[PDB]
Design a protein around this ligand. Structure first.
Ligand SMILES: NC(=O)C1=CN([C@@H]2O[C@H](COP(=O)(O)OP(=O)(O)OC[C@H]3O[C@@H](n4cnc5c(N)ncnc54)[C@H](OP(=O)(O)O)[C@@H]3O)[C@@H](O)[C@H]2O)C=CC1
Ligand SMILES: NC(=O)C1=CN([C@@H]2O[C@H](COP(=O)(O)OP(=O)(O)OC[C@H]3O[C@@H](n4cnc5c(N)ncnc54)[C@H](OP(=O)(O)O)[C@@H]3O)[C@@H](O)[C@H]2O)C=CC1
Lengths: 384, 384
């Protein structure tokens, strides 16, 4: 088989980078009991940089020893990219959400041999799932592989926004003291109403991390969480995001992107919030309406917005979220911490081993299979 | 009586600032059961900026209606400062740790009428406690008033360091994407060993907030915390900071500053940590050796350092912690969030009401009274 893999560019300093530490913690299970990936072997040491061109997700020897071909590129934009030129006879396409090889309907039509579209990470919205369904392409991802990474990043961003961290760090760097300037917009999180959009793998992890901050917890979802979970965490459920927006000081988004969630957080929802509320989005950019977010920050309707996800990706240098007021943005990085990479790279290999050996891809990894949403896709996504 | 009060300068934009929101949560009790301050009245709305010269800690009408004089200034350096010129006949001196009026032995000797040295905030190490004891001065502070603020700030800083937030935000602002550069130093906190120096009011609040991040928790203190606490959090105790340093990936400092803790975190302790460890210090700067911290970051012995506390305060523009590598500093702000200010300003008034009415200052607020460490001072401090 021909495996076409799109990864981000190597570090500016070169590859490998100068690692700050030489080992990372051992993780064996996720909080819900799901096991971490179980490939027969891995050809990297956890903690290495794997998601760039030279890192290769640690796949080359595995693939070539089996007689497969493995093409790795970062060049992914337009019909003259290495990606699009190599696509027509690729059996398998792999890319990460952080540097995504978009599989539009038009590209899927060109992809005459494509049978497996594998996300290295979580979130397969860069693939047109309706087109994949029609074409009989399997779409899979490494469920839970980097979810805890995201939960950490989201809580970090909530705190940075509410406490006014980023402008205050700039004052320290630039020689100032200026306590009044630092604290004129600095609040505690304690006692605020905080809600998540979704209480799935990441949303629940966020709610759990928020609990000891002594906030009042809310969530919205299409299907109510078990009473035991609501009791554990003191959750208040809302049938819709609009209703939750009315009562929350801070919202963090943790749903997948598909038609029902596209532009869910637009002006109508944002304007339901109290003036000076906060929004964090480490889910997908297009769950928000891009320009409505800018307007909310310009008016102070939102006191702050932060996230790691943008549209499109990579975000152009002129993207309006970069320098809108009161933002805590990063590039799309949370799911690509070195710790997360070890897990999604291992899971990418696990999935390939199953595929090549004619064994099932784990149900929880599936998004589309056999011409329909399947596994986690059927539980978390829609195509209507 | 004459009340001499040193506060920081007003916001650069003017006073009042443009508030992002017009109310904050109501807090009634601290996690150990201590009640929030109970002054007869407050002359501000919680959420207002109180800690600058124009804010006056909300004390002016209260004091002047009683016939007291109230002098508020930010001018605190040298013998010609308004502070030192007004000091010789001040009965009461008030200042905040964020902009501290240092009560050296020499200043205390000049302060012929001084009877009460009141910290607006927590941490009275800017007062020479031996000199206060000798002079028969009462030293008091608003215990717990801003401790939760600090705990939030510390956890925020831990996450920002481990995940490489600050340099990544810069890339977003400056038009880059550069995922490899962002994540080459980005780790998850999950599974790391994290320790606190002290498990007091703030240390315990930090440990509780860390728990759901699924880290392995450690602490050091002069005596063992209660069974319930060690069991609740799965704590491992170490008799010394050096011992804890050997096994922790991250340490956060939460002890008071006095001779036993001065320069505790010097090269001897830093070098016990594994290469690439992280240190957060929202306690007091001088618990660390200033230049040893710099050198540990320059060599990579520490992968990161962050805190809000400096020495001296204000830190000069050329202070080496501002632009040392891999830092997440802010000016001294955590205890002066608008939320914390509401509580310490209310407590400052409560203490003054007790004082003027010949009623006890709460035992838990006392640091020095009647010529010895007293109250919380006796439980948490030493005088060497
Ligand atoms: N920033 C990054 O690096 C990363 C981002 N992500 C993003 O986060 C998303 C969530 O990941 P994860 O928690 O692991 O996924 P899960 O599938 O576990 O959870 C998603 C939840 O979303 C809820 N949901 C679906 N539709 C809606 C709707 N219309 N409104 C509200 N809630 C909805 C579902 O609950 P219900 O059925 O009750 O509605 C489901 O439980 C991913 O799909 C991805 O886009 C993920 C990893 C990394
Ligand atoms: N950044 C900011 O804005 C703020 C900073 N702070 C700083 O944080 C400090 C802690 O505040 P808080 O938790 O409220 O104070 P507490 O008095 O509640 O706790 C201090 C703890 O320090 C421990 N301790 C004392 N001496 C030592 C030692 N030699 N080694 C190790 N532990 C020691 C004590 O435990 P044991 O007796 O078992 O040793 C005590 O429980 C303050 O004193 C202040 O300097 C406070 C507020 C705001």
């Amino acid at each position: 088989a021909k495996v076409l893999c799109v990864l981000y560019d190597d570090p500016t300093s070169g590859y490998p980078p100068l690692y700050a530490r030489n080992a990372i913690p051992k993780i064996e299970r996720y909080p819900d009991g799901q096991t971490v990936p179980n490939p027969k072997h891995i050809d990297f040491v956890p903690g290495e940089l794997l998601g760039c061109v030279s890192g290769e997700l640690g796949l080359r020897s595995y693939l070539e020893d089996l007689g497969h071909t493995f093409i790795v590129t970062s060049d992914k934009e337009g019909p003259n990219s290495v990606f699009e030129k190599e696509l027509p006879d690729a059996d398998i396409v792999i890319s990460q959400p952080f540097w995504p090889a978009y599989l539009t309907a038009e590209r899927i039509a060109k992809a005459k041999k494509l049978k497996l579209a594998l996300t290295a990470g979580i979130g397969s919205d860069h693939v047109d799932l309706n087109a994949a369904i029609k074409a009989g392409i399997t779409v899979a991802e490494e469920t839970f592989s980097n979810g805890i990474c995201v939960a950490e990043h989201a809580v970090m961003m909530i705190l940075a926004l509410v406490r006014n961290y980023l402008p205050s760090h700039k004052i320290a760097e630039e020689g100032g003291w200026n306590i009044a300037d630092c604290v004129s917009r600095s609040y505690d999180l304690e006692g605020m109403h905080v809600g998540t959009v979704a209480a799935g793998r990441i949303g629940l992890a966020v709610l759990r991390r928020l609990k000891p901050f002594d906030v009042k917890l809310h969530y919205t979802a299409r299907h109510r969480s078990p009473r035991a979970i609501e009791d554990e965490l003191g959750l208040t459920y809302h049938a819709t995001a609009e209703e939750m927006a009315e009562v929350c000081d801070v919202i963090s988004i943790h749903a997948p992107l598909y038609p029902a969630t596209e532009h869910l957080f637009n002006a109508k929802v944002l304007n339901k919030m109290r003036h000076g509320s906060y929004l964090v989005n480490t889910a997908r950019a297009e769950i928000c309406d891009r320009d409505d977010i800018v307007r909310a920050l310009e008016s102070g309707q939102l006191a702050g917005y932060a996230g790691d996800v943008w549209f499109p990706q990579p975000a152009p240098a002129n993207h309006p979220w970069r320098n809108m007021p009161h933002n805590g943005m990063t590039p799309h990085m949370s799911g690509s911490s070195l710790s997360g990479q070890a897990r999604y790279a291992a899971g990418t290999r696990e999935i390939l081993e199953c595929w090549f050996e004619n064994r099932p891809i784990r149900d929880e990894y599936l998004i589309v299979s056999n011409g329909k949403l399947a596994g986690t896709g059927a539980k978390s996504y829609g195509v209507g």
